[PDB]
Design a protein around this nucleic acid. Structure first.
Lengths: 144, 143
RNA sequence: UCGAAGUAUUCCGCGUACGUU
RNA sequence: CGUACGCGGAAUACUUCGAUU
């Protein structure tokens, strides 16, 4: 399109708050689970090992998709949140925002105050996923 | 008056080339192996499917950043030589030389085959950044 | 947790300039 | 690859404010 970046970036932002059945083609499979200001507050009577969950995001150039998924330190909750994005969902989702000119891609995830970013060129997105599902894996299993 | 580093950042910068000096405590345990501009087009005849000279990694403790480029030819004897570039105690020993009455944001980065892996986080979790950085380094260098 | 601002950094993508030519 | 900046991003650390009452 003409501008081609400003409007698509706003829809990617809004995609987070439009549940799993609203917005544009998203790289994530599961909907957002951000905690309200009140359920994140009363949860911090402990307080801020051992959060409600983690915050992850997928960025294809200027088109960034963000998520928050409540992740308890359990085997089942790990298999659940790991199904929030796969290689296919990213590739298919990136296909609608990449072109001939290589843009920057980045997957970032924060948990326990530790952030991991897997960034690279559009032509390296294939490795960014393998490295992101491997990095995401350990960060969530990072033995205290 | 809480300004400790005017300027230690540039000292950690030059530590890569002519150093470590004078006295800067570096996190890395190996000298820098950055190739020349020519050698950057000699080994690299023209990148064929890729195989680089090695990788570039950096260590940051606030605004004090250290950087190292190393050779890595995909051999196990080379993986082991580059994992000794920095360890847990080394960087921890290096981070304790740059702190303050405040939480500072540390950062490890490594680039290999057009893929970068940064592990950022407050100095309160540096112990985690290392444990996570050694796995990321090993994993990235094993694709 | 959401949104915004400043400060101090890092990293990616792209591009300019230079580098015993 | 080295240096320096330019654009657009993402991430971090400190700080400030707003978030049906």
């Amino acid at each position: 399109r003409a501008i081609q970046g400003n409007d698509t970036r706003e829809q990617a932002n809004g995609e987070r708050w439009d549940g799993g059945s609203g917005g544009i083609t998203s790289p994530f499979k599961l909907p957002d689970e951000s905690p309200s200001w009140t359920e994140w507050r009363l949860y911090n009577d402990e307080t801020n090992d051992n959060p409600l969950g983690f915050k992850e995001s997928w960025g294809f150039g200027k088109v960034v998709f963000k998520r928050y998924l409540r992740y308890d330190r359990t085997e089942a909750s790990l298999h659940r949140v790991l199904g929030s994005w796969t290689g296919d969902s990213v590739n298919y989702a990136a296909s609608r925002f990449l072109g001939a000119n290589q843009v920057g891609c980045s997957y970032s995830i924060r948990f326990r105050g530790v952030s991991v970013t897997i960034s690279g060129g559009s032509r390296t997105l294939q490795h960014l996923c393998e490295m992101a599902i491997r990095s995401k894996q350990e960060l969530l299993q990072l033995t205290p």
